[PDB]
């Protein structure tokens with residue numbers, strides 16, 4: 303029922319999910335002059351060497367790649383986190399034009415897209431329990447700007463025509479998510495929420511400072527996906543981003559000066 307259109311988009315979500323007007327909603331604008339450098343923050347530890355991707359699917363809101371999270375194969379540790387978080391899936395948010403598409407903004411600047419790598423805290427046993435806890439999820443957010451092609455993204459781009467419409471999925475094994483990371487792991491972090499329904503306030507956000515570059519031809523392929531199912535009127539899957547929400551009583555911390 304919810305989506306990103308005029309009649310079911312983010313301005314309507316509160317009617318079904320009242321937490322939309324909550325105290326720790328995401329995304330937010332990162333004001334770089336107001337963020338606080340925190341020397342107590344540790345470097346991120348990203349251990350994706352043993353990642354096992356399974357499937358790629360169009361869920362009607364985005365496309366996502368899912369991973370085997372039945373063991374500690376691909377994990378995120380360190381940074382602002384206590385304990386071990388397992389990689390579950392990644393997905394993107396993007397725009398109709400190159401000047402919009404990211405969810406987070408930096409000094410009000412929007413990027414062409416935003417990549418979310420979603421991880422859940424293993425102390426809670428399964429992702430469903432984790433979403434009910436204030437430290438249940440950690441999402442690594444990476445900005446995409448348009449420039450040179452990202453070789454590590456091309457395998458994803460090449461299969462999108464096979465999942466054009468809602469509900470379509472395909473086998474997507476042996477994909478290495480390390481190919482999507484920037485060089486630097488410097489980051490901002492703040493406590494927030496899922497950016498789609500159910501909008502649960504269960505996420506430690508880790509947003510990387512360094513964007514990755516993708517080519518115009520790569521992003522164009524994202525824009526050819528459909529929100530609709532096969533045999534419904536065609537509606538292009540674009541602008542699947544939630545606008546920035548009020549920071550309220552939160553401080554954004556930076557790992558770097």
Ligand SMILES: CCN[C@H]1C[C@@H](C)S(=O)(=O)c2sc(S(N)(=O)=O)cc21
Pocket residue numbers: 361363390391418420433441495496497498499500
């Ligand atoms: C379409 C629903 N997506 C929801 C529910 C679960 C799928 S999830 O994996 O906990 C997750 S992560 C994000 S985001 N955009 O904050 O990273 C949204 C979602």
Ligand SMILES: [Zn+2]
Pocket residue numbers: 393394395418497
């Ligand atoms: Zn997302």
